[PDB]
Amino acid sequence: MTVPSPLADPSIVPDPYPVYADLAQRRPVHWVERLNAWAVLTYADCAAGLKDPRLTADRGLPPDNIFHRWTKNVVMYTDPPLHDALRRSVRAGFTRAAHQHYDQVLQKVAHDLVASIPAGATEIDAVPALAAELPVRSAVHAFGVPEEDLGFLIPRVNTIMTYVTQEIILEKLTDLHTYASELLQGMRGKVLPDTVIARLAAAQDGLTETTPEQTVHQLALVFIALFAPTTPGSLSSGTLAFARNPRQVERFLADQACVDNTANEVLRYNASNQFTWRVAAKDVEMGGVRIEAGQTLALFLGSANRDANMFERPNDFDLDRPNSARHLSFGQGVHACLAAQLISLQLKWFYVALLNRFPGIRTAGEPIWNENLEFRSLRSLPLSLR
Ligand code: HEM
Numbered sequence: 001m002t003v004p005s006p007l008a009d010p011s012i013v014p015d016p017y018p019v020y021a022d023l024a025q026r027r028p029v030h031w032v033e034r035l036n037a038w039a040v041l042t043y044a045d046c047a048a049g050l051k052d053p054r055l056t057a058d059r060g061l062p063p064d065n066i067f068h069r070w071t072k073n074v075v076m077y078t079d080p081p082l083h084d085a086l087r088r089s090v091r092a093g094f095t096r097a098a099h100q101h102y103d104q105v106l107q108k109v110a111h112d113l114v115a116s117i118p119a120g121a122t123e124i125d126a127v128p129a130l131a132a133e134l135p136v137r138s139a140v141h142a143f144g145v146p147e148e149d150l151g152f153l154i155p156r157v158n159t160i161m162t163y164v165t166q167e168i169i170l171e172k173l174t175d176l177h178t179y180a181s182e183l184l185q186g187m188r189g190k191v192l193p194d195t196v197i198a199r200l201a202a203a204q205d206g207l208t209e210t211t212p213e214q215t216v217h218q219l220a221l222v223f224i225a226l227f228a229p230t231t232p233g234s235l236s237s238g239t240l241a242f243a244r245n246p247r248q249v250e251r252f253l254a255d256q257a258c259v260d261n262t263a264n265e266v267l268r269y270n271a272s273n274q275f276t277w278r279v280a281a282k283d284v285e286m287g288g289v290r291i292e293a294g295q296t297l298a299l300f301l302g303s304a305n306r307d308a309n310m311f312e313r314p315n316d317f318d319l320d321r322p323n324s325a326r327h328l329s330f331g332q333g334v335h336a337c338l339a340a341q342l343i344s345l346q347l348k349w350f351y352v353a354l355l356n357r358f359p360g361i362r363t364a365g366e367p368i369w370n371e372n373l374e375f376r377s378l379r380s381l382p383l384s385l386r
């Protein structure tokens, strides 16, 4: 627990993959002091870890604080059986029928955003112009966040997501709860019909295994996830991958199977959430290391996704890869991303619109990355359009 590791250093965020690969070969499970946790780097160990009921997500200041009340009442930080009740209680937003509707909505929203870039424009910064914007348009039109309430919501989520005191974070999380409960009573903006939130709102008279107060907690989680840097990061990193791989732009334009695999290969190529957290409920052994009950683990999804044992030539962005769907960028098992299909639709329709209008995208200078590996996301992506 005293051996140095570079994994929590901002210096590796621009390109963490050679670091992951060097460390995995020698110490696939090892202690990272700045994370206060055991890093887990291989695909096999990350996948086992996500499936392991001995590893809890219940990670939970005065004891009645809102962070504790929130975490103990949302799917992301609870274990079965409560987790499973909480997850069933939001199923109405994410049915097969709902996704057939979101498919159509997201095709149009992505098309219209890309079409708003003048055809004669020669350059853009694809992060603010596109990657930051499409998730907001999707939040409004697919999820049903009222357009008129974005001024309230987005800056508060940005503050909560800061890489600012503990007091301020508790205040903004309190505000999200206030907003969520008032939204459901018609006191805030108008929720568009047939959206995720409209469906959840209509389901509230039918609760059987969760409480109205838990709906409020979970909606606060949804707002944080919606405006987190994860969706922008996926959009911008995939845009960079196409800009650096013109042969894959060609394959995308030539082959519907490549289009169909684009969301998953983009997600595999760069996990936005490069690691997620677990706590050992009981002693476990991983990577030859005895991890004791109570200790924290960081499962490096981003490393797993470039493990050559699962993905041959893992550093190739390859739309013809046959097993891209095995990526761990949405996790796996109990806590697998609630919005996985919504996100993959958003990604698919973005690249359809982008590469048909601007097949000639290329970088116009070096991309600039952020400094937080956990929520890894380009700050700027200067892009020539022609
Ligand atoms: C590219 C965008 C996104 C990525 C890469 C992503 C990634 C993830 C990952 C890795 C997990 C599993 C965490 C774990 O096992 O500890 C997860 C869970 C979750 N995600 Fe996403 N997410 C994205 C967008 C969203 C959005 C927009 C929403 C809005 C609803 C969302 C809602 C959730 C929820 C509620 C969970 C917890 C599910 C449960 O515990 O049962 N995610 N996500």
Ligand SMILES: [Li+]
Pocket: 370, 371, 379
């Ligand atoms: Li940043």
